[PDB]
Ligand binder design. Sequence first.
Ligand code: NA
Ligand code: NA
Ligand code: NA
Length: 444
Amino acid sequence: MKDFSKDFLFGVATASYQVEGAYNEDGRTMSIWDTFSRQDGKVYKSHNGDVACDHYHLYKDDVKMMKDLGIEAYRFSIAWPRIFPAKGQYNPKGMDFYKRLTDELLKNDIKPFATIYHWDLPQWADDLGGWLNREIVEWYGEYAEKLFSELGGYIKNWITLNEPWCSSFLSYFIGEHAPGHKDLGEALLVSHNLLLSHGKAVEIFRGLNLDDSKIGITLNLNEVFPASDSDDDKVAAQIADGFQNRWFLDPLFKGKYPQDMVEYFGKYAKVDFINDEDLKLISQKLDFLGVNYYTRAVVQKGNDGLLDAVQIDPGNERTEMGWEIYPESLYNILMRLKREYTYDMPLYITENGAAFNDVVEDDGRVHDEKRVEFLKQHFKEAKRFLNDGGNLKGYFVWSLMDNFEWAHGYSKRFGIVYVDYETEKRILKDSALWYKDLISTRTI
Ligand code: NA
Ligand code: NA
Ligand code: NA
């Protein structure tokens, strides 16, 4: 038979600011990431996404490249600053790009999966307070409603937000991502307004009753292991798990923030944004959950400070991000969702992949055998989850191509296709050739 059914979706994923370029063309105005990458010290070597992979101009070649690999589904994001470059000011020229992109996908038998928000908030919205201003729920709803109405005939699979943990905690508490604040109370409120905005889009979507169309959200999830069996490390792992995973899983799928984290965060910041009406909107039923999985964490108790767990190096192989290669946690997280949160609801892996030190050798090839083995190990866990009764509907490799990796700039390469940025040439890596064979044979 087939390890992966004919209906299982083998996909690849990108995001608008990471690949498109054309940052000032056809009416697009700045996003928070255009602004952030221009602030000294925020992004590696002051890299930015002015040009990136030039996918805005090269999309037809890129779709042909996906067709020739046999890609069945393509996850991309839609740039809010192209669609509403000013508050309340719709830009048809921006919408026209996503129509010609998705028309090209459909004509090449590739199913579009569209992420509505993948971090490129319009600068005009941030200047009005951004995700800290509860009015953003209405601005985001207007934006999502316009996408559903204009693109509903092109796109049948919608993702409201990508990785709200990054847009809240990494952007407003840790400060690594745009807009780069460092205040726990802000990050908590932002996390709530993100989830409420997701809820507004789901409410709008259900009211439109679009035929054969599905909506979900994408979360980056990990698995947290205590470094030892001590009570100290058990509490440390519980906090780390609540910080990364349960803070978003619980309001979405239980209609309640995790009470141990509410009490823990409440010692350090306000948690008064919580109320019944908002949690009802936040927890509306979804059609699927998208899982972004990369690695686990092994943690031991720190200094009893705020979120200060010591990161333990268990001595195993890692990527160029420093992330442990630990494929069993993909299976463990999918099973955890099946047993604790999503039950029989469809799951997609909406990102999994790895950054390695890729070089084009004298033969013109990129022999990225570490990425081949990485993807092989993780697709084997996906197969094991399926064979154990898990409802996995597809798997999107991060990424189709090397691109702008946020605060790391272009210094981390995640593609199965190599991009020579000087010429914008695409070179299939050995991982792409391996993936092409997996899709064709459906055997691993
Ligand atoms: Na860009
Ligand atoms: Na810059
Ligand atoms: Na749901």
